[PDB]
Amino acid sequence: MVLEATVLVIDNSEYSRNGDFPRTRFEAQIDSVEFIFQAKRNSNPENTVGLISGAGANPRVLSTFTAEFGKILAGLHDTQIEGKLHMATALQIAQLTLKHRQNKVQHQRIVAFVCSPISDSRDELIRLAKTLKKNNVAVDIINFGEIEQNTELLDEFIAAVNNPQEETSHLLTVTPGPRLLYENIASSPIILEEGSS
């Protein structure tokens, strides 16, 4: 939980412009990342957080490793929802970003929002699940996007990853209906999960 560097992938899709959370879903994601950003920093002040997007023709880099909420919150508002999820290509980009860190004693975490159907195959993501625990990164999937017209397949990639690693992997289950997004992250583990050895 503590001594950790997190690369967040905020999913920005054309399913976030809809009222599913007040006012629009997009705006509740700005509120919820501010929770994750500030919480981990308060619990260890050598914890820094980068930001990439699951939007665009390819994923882009919103922000680098940082202790500035000024820098994070500039990129959460000013990302656009005209993109599309690109989950596989986003997980690999994080792997490059978490290759280098500020302090090399910090744990590797990806926390990926899913707000939309997948564009990448299950099979590809099976094979990439084993690449994640080969590089001792834990992966946390925030689930509300997989249950808008699909049977959930995310449990599967979590289960494969999940070992004694350097961190716990977890599946957070969020209600995609209106019950306010920031709150739903708080009550699920996000500082209630404790890293494994």
Binding site: N58, V61, T64, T89, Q92, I93, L96, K99, H100
Partner: protein, 152 residues
């Protein structure tokens, strides 16, 4: 952006400093490195006055998976303005020896950073062509033969 950028004047410093960046990072054997090129622009003659490495990372599984660090770019601009008020962002060098299609995507980053179409500068540091040690390229959008779309 900017339209006038027709001929690219290239200081002898540029070819030698790109050459030095490649071999002082120990990026070799087609691990590419991306650094910025600074100079003057907004006019037909494009002077590249100075050049410096940036942090970059590349993947051999899919080649359209990479890291570019934006934070270093911001700090560079602040520092060098004082050195000479003749260095502003005019694009980025790509270390070569070849043009990729992956350099098409990386270009959209540099197009955002600076309001001109950004110069791509190939510095051939492996010198397998007897001419052209420098090639200059500006990404533009044009409608493309054989009934095809507006392509980059």
């Amino acid at each position: 952006m900017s339209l006038q950028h027709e001929k690219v004047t290239i200081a002898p410093l540029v070819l030698l400093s790109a050459l030095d960046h490649y071999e002082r990072t120990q990026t070799k054997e087609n691990k590419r490195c991306v650094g910025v090129i600074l100079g003057d622009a907004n006019s037909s003659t494009i002077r590249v006055t100075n050049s410096f490495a940036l942090p970059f990372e590349e993947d051999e599984k899919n080649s359209d998976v990479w890291f570019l660090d934006h934070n270093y770019i911001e700090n560079m601009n602040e520092m060098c303005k004082k050195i000479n008020a003749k260095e502003k962002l005019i694009g980025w060098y790509h270390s070569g020896p070849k043009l990729r299609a992956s350099d098409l995507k990386i270009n959209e980053l540099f197009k955002k950073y600076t309001q001109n179409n950004p110069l791509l500068l190939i510095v051939d540091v492996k010198q397998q062509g007897v001419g052209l040690p420098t090639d200059a390229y500006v990404a533009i959008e044009q409608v493309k033969d054989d009934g095809t779309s507006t392509e980059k």
